[PDB]
Amino acid sequence: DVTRIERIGAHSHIRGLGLDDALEPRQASQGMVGQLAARRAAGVVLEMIREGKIAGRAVLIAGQPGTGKTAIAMGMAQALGPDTPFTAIAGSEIFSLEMSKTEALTQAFRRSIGVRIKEETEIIEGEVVEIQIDRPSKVGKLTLKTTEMETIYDLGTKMIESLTKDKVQAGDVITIDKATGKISKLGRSFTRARDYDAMGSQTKFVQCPDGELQKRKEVVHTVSLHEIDVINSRTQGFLALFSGDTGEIKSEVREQINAKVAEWREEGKAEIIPGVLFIDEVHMLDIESFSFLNRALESDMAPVLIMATNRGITRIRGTSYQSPHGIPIDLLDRLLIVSTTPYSEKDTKQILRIRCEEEDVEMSEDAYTVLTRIGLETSLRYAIQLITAASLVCRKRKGTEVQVDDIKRVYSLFLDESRSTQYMKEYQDAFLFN
Amino acid sequence: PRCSVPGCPHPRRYACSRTGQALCSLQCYRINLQMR
Amino acid sequence: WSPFHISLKPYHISKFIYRHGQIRVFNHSRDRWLRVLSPFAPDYIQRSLFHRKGINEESCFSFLRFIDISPAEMANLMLQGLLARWLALFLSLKASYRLHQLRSWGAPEGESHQRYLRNKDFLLGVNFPLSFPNLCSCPLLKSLVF
Amino acid sequence: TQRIASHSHVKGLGLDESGLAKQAASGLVGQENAREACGVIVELIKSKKMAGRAVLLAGPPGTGKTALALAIAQELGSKVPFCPMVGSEVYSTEIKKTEVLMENFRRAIGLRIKETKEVYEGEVTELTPCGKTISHVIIGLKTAKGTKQLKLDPSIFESLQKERVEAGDVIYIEANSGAVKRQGRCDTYATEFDLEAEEYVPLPKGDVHKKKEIIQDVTLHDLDVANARPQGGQDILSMMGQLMKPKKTEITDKLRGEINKVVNKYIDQGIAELVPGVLFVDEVHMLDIECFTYLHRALESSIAPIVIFASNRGNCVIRGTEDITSPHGIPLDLLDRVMIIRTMLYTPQEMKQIIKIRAQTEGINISEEALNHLGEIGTKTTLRYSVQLLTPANLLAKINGKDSIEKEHVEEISELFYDAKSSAKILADQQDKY
Amino acid sequence: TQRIASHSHVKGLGLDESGLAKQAASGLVGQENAREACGVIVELIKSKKMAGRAVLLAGPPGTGKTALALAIAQELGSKVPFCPMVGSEVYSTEIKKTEVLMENFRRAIGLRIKETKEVYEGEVTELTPCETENPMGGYGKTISHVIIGLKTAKGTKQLKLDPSIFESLQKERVEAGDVIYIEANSGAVKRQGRCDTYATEFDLEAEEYVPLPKGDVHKKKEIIQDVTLHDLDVANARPQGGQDILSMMGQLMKPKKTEITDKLRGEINKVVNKYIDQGIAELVPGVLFVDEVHMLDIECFTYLHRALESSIAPIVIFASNRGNCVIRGTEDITSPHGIPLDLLDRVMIIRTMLYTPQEMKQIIKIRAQTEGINISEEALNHLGEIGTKTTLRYSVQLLTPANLLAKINGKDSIEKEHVEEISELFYDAKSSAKILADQQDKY
Amino acid sequence: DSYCNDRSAEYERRVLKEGGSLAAKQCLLNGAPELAADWLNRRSQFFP
Ligand SMILES: Nc1ncnc2c1ncn2[C@@H]1O[C@H](COP(=O)(O)OP(=O)(O)OP(=O)(O)O)[C@@H](O)[C@H]1O
C-alpha cells in the first residue's frame, strides 16, 4: 500500500554483484546479468576495497553507452553494503561556485574514508515524573519513569539551576549524559498528550522510553574523515556539515587531522575503514582536475577510486588535446582499466526479464521477443523504458499480461533517438538552428 | 554508597521511587521490588 | 563641521500586507512541519545516535559525541538562530582554555585502559602552537601574534 | 477574475476512457499522437512506482510542447506537485549549476500531511497562571456566539506575554501550532479612555472554536532548505537577524540522506504520505553539458521525480561543448535516457479550431469571415502570431463600436503589427541602416 | 596495521658517503644521475645558505620524478618543512592565483622556537586569606597574601599568592575540591571542574568531573614549538583571542581566506629577525615541492619570477611530465615542459629517464616486498615483461589484484597463472586506446 | 525604518528599535549577557 520515498529507479534491481565465493560470476544473479569479465574485475577490486591494505588505487569502468558501467558501480556499492563508505558523484558535481575544483575533489575523497571509534557512555533516559527541592545551597530530588521502572535521583546544586533554567515539567521525557551533566528534552510523554489544550509553538509527543533507565555501554561510531576536517575549520564548523558552507579548508588543518588519526590508529583508539569514491561520468573533469587526481591517488589515506565514461578517443575538457576516454595519459596509467562489452540477445532477454521482475510486470514470450529485438535494433535503455509504458497501456486496455499489440502501441507513441532524429530531418527547417 | 540488594557490589546510581532503597540497575530494581 | 544628516520618510507597509501578506505568519502552520520533520529534533538525534540496529551502522550526529554538544544543544543551535550561535561561541571560548590545559599536561596510558576516545577529542583546533589558549600560555609566541 | 494567460484554456489532455485522444476536448485540438502518449505519462505519475523516469517533448516553435506539459499538470490536479523550470534558471550566482538541478528535483516530490486546524478566537475574559509560581495558564475567550476556558501551556503564554496581551484584548489562537495574534482591543473597552493608542475591534461575530480538517502540501526541498541553514527563529523582535544575509547555499547530500531517513520514519508512522510529482524543464537545450552530465546521475536516482523536458532546436551545437552538434540540443548519451514524444505542425484546419478556442476564452466574439482570415494569415505565418491578433482586433472593434471581430479589424491589425517573417524581409531591404 | 601508498617504499636517495648513487638502495632503483643531482640539492637545502634556488624534475610519466621529490623529504627528515603541492592548487575561488603561490612560499619556512611552560595545578583544598597582625591605620583588616592549598596524586602543598588573586577566585566560581590551574608566567587562575573524588557525592550533578592531576603541584617543561611563517601570517591576519565584537563577528562569519599584504610579510620578517638575533628562535628554511607544474597559468609563472628571486624564498622543486605543450592561459605559445622559456631559464633541470626492463623487474620486486606480497620468479619475470609492453604504473599495480586472486584460488604467493588472468581482466592505457579506435563510432 | 498602520506592527518595530531583547542587545553591546552582568559590578573590582 504505502509508497516509501525510495522506489523503482534505473538500477533498483541490482542487489549485489553476483559472484560465487571464488569470485566466479554467475550468468544471472543478485539482479545482474552478463558482463562476466567486467564482473570478475569488479569482484577483485571489491575484495581489494574490503582488505583496505593499500591506498590511492583506482579503476576505470570503460565501454559503450548502455552497457552497465553505472550498473556495475551501483551494484558493487551494495555488495560492499553499508558499514564502509561509498561516495558516489557525477563528475560535474565538483564544479562548485564557492570552492576550487581541487577542494571539491579533496572533500569528495575525505568523505570516502571512515574513522571508526569506540566511545564509552552512560545516559539516563525517561519521563520526569516530578522534581522536588528544599528552599534555603539547594538540595533536591527528581523522579524518572521508564516502561520498566519508576526511580529517584539525589541531585546537586548546579543540576537544580540547570533543570529550572531549562524549564522541565512533569511528564516531559528527558535524557542526560551523567559524565557530562548536559540535559536534553525529547518531548512530552504520549500518556500526557492531553493535559494542555493549546500547544506551544514547538512541542512533540514521544512514547515513554523502555528497558533500563541508566544505560551504561560502549558504542561504535563511524565518522567520515571529512567531518573531522570540517569540525576543525572554524569554532562552530560542524554546521557546515549540513549547510555545505565548507569554503576551502586550510591545508594546515587536513595535515593535522592525518597526523592525529595516524596517532589514534597506532594507539588503537580508532580504525580507518577505507571506502570508495565513485566518479560517474569522470570525463566531465577538467585537465586542472585530472592533474590533481595524479597526487590525490598517492596519499597514505586516499580511498579506492572508481570511474566510468562513455568517451572514445576524445578532447580533454579545458584543452584541445585528444586522449583515450577523455582522460589524460598521466592519469590513465595510474588507473587500472576494466572494459564492459555490448550485450548479446541472450543477455538482453535476461535483463529485460529482471526489469519486469523488479517493476512487477508480466509479459508474453512473444512480447519479450519483440521487446528484445527493439532493445537490440535500438539501445537497451529504450526497451527498458517501453515495458513500464506497456504496463500502463495494458492497464488502460483492461489487460493483465502485456502483449505484442501493447508493445507496438507504445513503440508508436514514444520514439527512440533514431526515429526522432529521422522525423526531425523530415521537417528540419521548422526547428531552430540546423 | 552501594546497592541496597545484598548480593550486589555496584555503586548507588539512584533509589527506588516506591520503596526508597538505594539501587544500581534494573536487575537490582526488580530484585528489591520483589522482596519489599 | 558634521555630515549632512538625512531621514527619508519611513517605508509604508499597509495593515493588510502586515496581517495577511507575511509568509512567516500566514504559512506558520506549514512551517511547524518543516521544524517537526527535521533530523535536528532531539528525539531523532537520540533515535539515530543511541538506538541503532547494527553494531556498525552509518549514523549522522556521531560527531556530537566528540564535540561537546548535547542533542538538545544541536537542536537549539539549529532552531534558535544567531543568538544561540553567539552564546554557544562565547561558552566555547571559555571551554578552549579548560581543554588546552588537560590536552597539554595530561599524558598517561590513554583515555581509558589504553582505548576509546573521550568527549571534546574532535576539537583539535586547540593543538596548534598558535591557537589562542597555547599562545596566551606562551609569552614568547604571544609577542609574534601582535 | 483570473487574467487570461497564454495557456489559460488548456484544462486537460481530453482523452476518452480508452486513453485515445478526442479530436477537440479540454481546450486542446489535434496533436493526437502526443496527447495519447501524455495519457500514458499521467498514468505513470499517478502510479507512483517509478523514480527519475523521463520524457522529451520534441518539435517546432508553436506546436503545443509547453501546452501538453501543462495539460499533464491539469490531468494530475493540485494534489501532485508539478514544478515548472526554464533550463536558463540553472545559471545561479550563489550556487553551482548541478545544485539548482538537485533543488528542482527535490521541489517535485511532495509530502501530503493531514491535520485538524483548530482555531480559538475572541475577547480574552481572563488570563490566570496556576516549584511554585508557574504550571500552566487558564485563559477565557468570548464571542457573540458564546464563551470557553482554554488550558494553555506556559510556552503558549510566553507568546501572549510577547504579544503584550491583557484581559479584554481580541485574540486568535491556533491550537495546533501556537500561532497567537493580538487583533486589537475589544470595542466594549473603546471608552476606557477618550483617546488611546490601541486599535479597537468589535467582538467577533463568529464561533469561539473552529475545527477544519486541512491538508499541508510540502516539498522535500522545503524540508531541506528549512533545515540546512540555521532557522531564523527571529520574528523581527531580535536585531541579530539583521547582520547575516540569508544567501542560498550548496545543501549537501550528507543532509538529504537524513531528510530521506526522517521522511521514511514519518510515512512509516502514517503521519504523512508521499506524492511523487513532475519536474518540468522548459528550454532543456539551454542546460550546459555539465548539467546534462549531472542528469546521468539524477535521472537514475531511486528517489527522483518524473522529469519532462521540452525542446524546439534542430541538430544544433550542445550548449557549452563549443563544437558538438546533437539532435534537440541534447547530448546523445542523455537523449538515450528519455522517452521522446514527437510533436507536429498544424494544418490550417487545426489552426481555425485553436483561434476559435482562444477567442471564446479571451472574451472575443468573432464573425466566421474574420475567423476564416485569422485561419488564412496563420497559414502564411505561425499559430502563435494569429492567436496574438485577437485582443488587438477586439480592441479596435470596441473603439469602432462593434461587439464582434469583422474582416476590416483583423485586416487593419495585420498591416499594423508585423510578424517575424514579415520583419525579416524589411531587415534584408533596409540592411545597411540598422 | 598501516595501509600502503604508491610511494611508501621510498626511504631516501640511498647515496654513498662520496655522494655517488647505488644501483638499488633505500627503496629506489636506478636514476643514478638524477639521485646524484638530488644529493646536491639535499646538501643545498641542508646548508640553509640559499633562497629561491629551484629545480625542475623533467621526464616522462612514471619515471620517478615524484618519487625523487619525496625521497628528498626523507633525506631531510621531518625536522624541516617540506610543503607538497600540485600546480592546480593555485585555482582557488577565495583568493587570487598568485597569493596561493605566496602562501606555499611561506609554508616552506619554519620557525623552531623554544620556551618554558610553568604552571601550578591541583585540587584546591583551601583558600586562606592571611591577615597581618596589625592593619594599616584607618582599616578594619588587611591581608598580605592568600594561601591556596593545592593537591595532586603525588602530594599536597600550600602556595602563597598576591591578594589581587581573590577577585579572580570568585570570577571563576572556585570552591574547595575544584581542580584549578595558574600560569606561572602570567598569574591568571582558571577552573577545570570538580575533582573526580567527588563524582559519587550525588546521583546527578550538572558538571563534568575532572580526573585528579598527577605529577607535582608545580610543573615545568621546556617545549620546542614549530610554526611556519604562514602560520604567523594567518594568526596575525585573523586574530583568535575573541573577546571583542569584531573578533566574534569575524568568527561567526565564514572563515574566508584573504589576500595578505606585502606589509604583514614585512612586519613578520622584521620581528622573527629580532628573535633569531636574540637566539630565541631557530629558523629552518625548507622545500616547496610543486608536482604537475605545467598546470600553473602564465600569470602564475610570471609571478614565480619575483617569488624565486626574493631573498626570503624557500628552495623550490618543480616536476613536469609534459613535452612541448602550450603554456596554460595563452592560445599559441608552446614551451618545453609546459613551462615558459623565461621561467625555465631560472631552474636547474634534472633529467629523469625511462627504465630499462631489468630495472622495472627490480622495482616491482621492491613494491612486492613492501606491499607485503610474495611472488614466484617466473611470475615476476612475466610481470617485468608486462612492464616492458606497457609502463611501470601498470605492471607494478597488478601485484595486489594478483594477490587477491591467488588468495581466493587457495595460494599464499603469486604464480604465473595469476598474472596472465589479471592481465586478461584489466587493460592499460595503450591496450584500451586500441579498443577505443576499433569502436570509435559507438562511443 | 518601516511604518505600519497596526498596533501589533508598532510593538514589533518599537521592540526592535529599543534593541530586540535584553539578551541580544547585551550580546552586541557588552559581548555576552554574562559580560553585561559582570560589567555592572566590574565597576567595583580592582583587576576586571
Ligand atoms: N494542440 C493545441 N491545443 C491548444 N493550444 C495549442 C495547441 N498546440 C499549441 N497551442 C498553443 O500554442 C501556444 C504556444 O505554446 P506552445 O506549447 O505551442 O509553445 P511551444 O512552441 O510548443 O513551446 P516552446 O516555445 O517552449 O517550444 C499556446 O497558446 C498554446 O495553447
Ligand SMILES: Nc1ncnc2c1ncn2[C@@H]1O[C@H](COP(=O)(O)OP(=O)(O)O)[C@@H](O)[C@H]1O
Ligand atoms: N549487467 C547488467 N545487469 C543488470 N542491469 C544492467 C546491466 N547492465 C546494464 N543494466 C541496466 O541497463 C541500463 C543501462 O546501464 P547503465 O549502467 O546505466 O549504462 P551506462 O553504463 O551507459 O551508464 C540501466 O537500467 C541498468 O540498470
Ligand SMILES: Nc1ncnc2c1ncn2[C@@H]1O[C@H](COP(=O)(O)OP(=O)(O)O)[C@@H](O)[C@H]1O
Ligand atoms: N627509482 C625508483 N625506484 C623505485 N620505485 C620507483 C622509482 N621511480 C618510481 N618508482 C615507482 O614508480 C611509480 C611511478 O613514478 P612516480 O614518480 O610516482 O610517477 P612520475 O614519474 O610520473 O612522477 C612510483 O610511484 C613508484 O611506485
Ligand SMILES: [Zn+2]
Ligand atoms: Zn546491597
